[PDB]
Amino acid sequence: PQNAKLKIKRPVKVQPIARRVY
């Protein structure tokens, strides 16, 4: 999809949502 798994690193933006455990 859009760079590394889903949308920018894993789920949305750096790991899951905004720095891993969002």
Swiss-Prot record:
Coiled coil: none annotated. Transmembrane segments: none annotated. Disulfide bonds: none annotated. It is found in: Cytoplasm. Monomer. Trans-acting protein required for termination of DNA replication. Binds to DNA replication terminator sequences (terA to terF) to prevent the passage of replication forks. The termination efficiency will be affected by the affinity of this protein for the terminator sequence. Belongs to the Tus family. This is DNA replication terminus site-binding protein. It comes from Escherichia coli (strain K12). The chain holds residues 223 to 244 of 309 of the full protein.
